[PDB]
Amino acid sequence: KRCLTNNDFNEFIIEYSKGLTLRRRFNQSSDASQSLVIKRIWTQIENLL
Amino acid sequence: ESKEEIKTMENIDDEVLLEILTDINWSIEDDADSMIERIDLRLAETEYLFNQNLLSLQKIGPNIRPYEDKVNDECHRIIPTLSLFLMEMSNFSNDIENVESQDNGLQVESANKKLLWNTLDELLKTVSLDEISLNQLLECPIREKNLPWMENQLNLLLKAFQAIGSDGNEVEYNLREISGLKQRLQFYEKVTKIFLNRIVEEMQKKFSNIRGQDISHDQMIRILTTLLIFSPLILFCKEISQKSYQAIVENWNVSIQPVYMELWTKKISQLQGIDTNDEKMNELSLSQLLNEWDTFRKERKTNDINPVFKNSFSLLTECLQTMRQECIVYQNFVEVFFHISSKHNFEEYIKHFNDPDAPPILLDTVKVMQSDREAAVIETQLVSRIFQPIVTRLSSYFVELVKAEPTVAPALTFYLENEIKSLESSNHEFLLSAVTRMYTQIKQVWSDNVEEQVLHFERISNATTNGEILPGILDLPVGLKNSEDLFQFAKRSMDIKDTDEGYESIELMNSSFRKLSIAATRSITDYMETISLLVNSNWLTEMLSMDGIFDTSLQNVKKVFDVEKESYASFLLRDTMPKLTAFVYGVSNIIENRQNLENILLAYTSHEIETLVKRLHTHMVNDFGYHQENAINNVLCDKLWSCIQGQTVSLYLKLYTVIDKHKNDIISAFEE
Structure with missing residues (x-):
């Protein structure tokens, strides 16, 4: 919802996937086999694209 | 930016996916976390409900079990008499032993087989220590013919475990004081080399099982290869001395479950093929009720094209491939360790008996297993968007x-997940189509009534036509949702119970909630909507409601009571009396298989509404003359004067209609 809103702020993509890139590195400091968290940063990836 | 932890297999992913598969992890929700709290309270009342269900009630059901179980305490109460009988014979006879052998007693003077030999009677501990046949009679092995590593070096490793390696001396006895320092350290050093040999034979032979993908799927090479692993798990020292042989059966098969699990994962999800739109088959279950019954049926039972196994194929395939995730994983109950039991010295009995079935086979155990997640979620999640099922x-x-x-397998929990393919398969059970019947009886009343605002008259000038669709050709899917509930649903059966029916109360909401949805058709109760109403209800109630399996009978005579009450209202300016009520009021529906002239689409002979209003107002209202006409005919007087020869007393009776609203001699006696 932040994405289409403003820029996404850009911080609502930039800082939002910064402080979410924290927990997207919960999904990257190990992954096995958190298809939940993999689905999380998966949709983060598709939205960022 | 604040890079978080190493998410490597925490307290989740143990079906926390399937936990979050309540509704969706589709954005996201903490609202759905509250929904999880609601399902948690639902389980709380279902489990307190199970608690007081079983707390005195089915704890008396457990006393109803104690018929058989206290009966086992009754034959076992004869075992109390057999146990006090044998314990009384041996109680008094062993007291006779206490006075008999111990005449002096003085066991060093009366029973000195063990008082001369306080340690010398326990002098059979000469098999110490190591390590000749531990690695000579097993190179890696010398086995696979009930040979010296099966028959002897195995049992020599049972002598490595008969040697209690930490119960060394008790130095007044002193059997393995320094012999126990390297007895099973060289027998478990050489058998640590045989242990790494069977570990490399486990990753190697199980990588050959990963190459073994014989016939849909089948890992038969893992079955004959599993015959080459029963000796490794029998191997009674014991066999996993430090949880290692089972780690060659499980932690080695950890990645080698995912060769079979990845195999079924990419395998089973590829059978996708479907239709597009089947109004033809609803014209075959609309053509069924057309030439029925009233005729020979029509349907056969006809289609029901879903009865062709587009998804019922997996009911014997992905329940069988689910029975590879379960029942050939219950042939991984021939490969868990196997079935570790039993050989006992150390490969003696499983040197002979190393042939399991294993599946399935009965139920008396307690165990746990894995390797059934994605086949189950694949079978159900594949079967998800299935809106015609599960009616048929x-x-x-x-x-x-x-x-x-x-x-004793988790195929019951699979059948409970396949009960979840009936029950957590959601309200389909599709009574939200009744919400589509009232919600689309109100928010779609701006199209059907847009031709039918005046429907049974012409004051607001509209034709009596609205339509029965939803559930018009879904009444055709009552014969198609009911026809394939006896052939397709019957050819989907299994062990207890499984059809054996016995079941399919769905299929009784095809009576109950189909008369509730048909009560929304009673809330949908126009004269092509009265005609389509009773024609749609009786388009299900000609064959499907007598086989008499429905409950919409009073719905059919209720909407058909609105077809009598609104077809003699649409023809309330026409029949009057019976001159349009037989061939022009009900036969605007009976031969159909503004409402004054608007019954002229079929308009069954004779005296239709195109002549009952015109050729009765054209020198016929009084008579051809005036009281009365010289015509009792069947061509044009049926609109004119045979109508008057069918409504003769209805002249004065119809003139009596002004005799209450706003004496009776000069009209009702001498009407000419």
Whole structure:
């Protein structure tokens, strides 16, 4: 919802996937086999694209 | 930016996916976390409900079990008499032993087989220590012919475990004081080399099992290869001395489950093929009720094209491939360790008996296993968007519910997941189509009534036409949702219970909630909507409601009571009296298989509404003359004067209509 809103702020993509890139590195400091968290940063990836 | 932890297999992913598969992890929700709290309270009342259900009630059901179980305490109460009988014979006879051998007693003077030999009677500890036949009679092995590593070096490793390596001396006895320093350290050093040999034979032979993908799927090379692993798990020292042989059966098969699990994962999800739009088959279950009954049926039972196994194929395939995730994983109950039991010295009995079935086979155990997640979620999540099912698939998904009673496998939990393919398969059970019947009886009343605002008259000038669609050709799917509930649903059966029906109360909401949805058709109760109403209800109630399996009978005579009450209102300016009520009021529906002239689409002979209003107002209202006409005919006087020869007393009776609203001699006696 932040994405289409403003820029996404850009911080609502930039800082939002910064402080979410924290927990997207919960999904990257190990992954096995958190298809939940993999689905999380998966949709983060598709939205960022 | 604040890079978080190493998410490597925490307290989640143990079906926390399937936990979050309540509704969706589709954005996101903490609202759905509250929904999880609601399902948690639902389980709380279902489990307190199970608690007081079983707390005195089915704890007396457990006393109803104690018929058989206190009966086992009754033959076992003869075992109390056999146990006090043998314990009384040996109690008094052993007291006779206490006075008999111990005449002096003085056991060093009366029973000195062990008082001369306080340690010398326990002098059979000469098999110390190591390590000749530990690695000579097993190179890696010398086995596979009930040979010296099966018959002897195995049992020599049982002598490595007969040697209690930490019960060394008790130095007044001193059997293995320094012999126990390297007895099973060289027997478990050489058998640590045989242990790494069977570990490399486990990753190697199980990588050959990963190459073994014989016939849909089948890992038969892993079955004959599993015959080459029963000796490794029998191997009684014991066999996993430090949880290692089972780690060659499980932690080695950890990645080698995912070769079979990845195999079924990419395998089973590829059978996708479907239709597009089947109004033809609803014209075959609309053509069924046309030439029925009233004729020879029509349907056969006809289609029901879903009865062709587009998804019922997996009911014997992905329940069988699910029975590879379960029942050939219950042939991984021939490969868990196997079945570690039993050989006992150390490969003696399984040197002979190393041939399991294993599946399935009964139920008396307690165990746990894995390797059934993605085949189950693949079978159900594949079967998800299935909106025609499970109406015709009532006994299919309920046979799936009642699939596995008597095994000791998790196929019951699969059958409970296949009950979840009936029950957590959501309200389909589709009574939200009744919400589409009232919600689309109100928010779609701006199209059907847009031709039918005046429907049964012409004051607001509209034709009596609205339509019965939803559920018009869904009444055709009552014969198509009911026809394939006896062939397709019956050919989806299994063990206890599973059709065996016995089941399919869905399929009784095809009576109950179909007369509730048909009560929304009673809330949908125009004269092509009265005509389509009773024609749609009786388009289900000509064959499907007598086989008499429905409950919309009073709905059919209720909407058909609105067809009598609104077809003699649409013809309330026409019949009057019976001159349009037989061939022009009900036969605007009977031969159909503004409402003054608007029954002229079929307009069954004779005296239709195109002549009952015109050729009765054209020198016929009084008579051809005036009281009365010289015509009792069947061509044009049926609109004019045979109508008057069918409504003769209805002249004065119709003139009496002004005799209450706003004496009777000069009209009702001498009407000419």
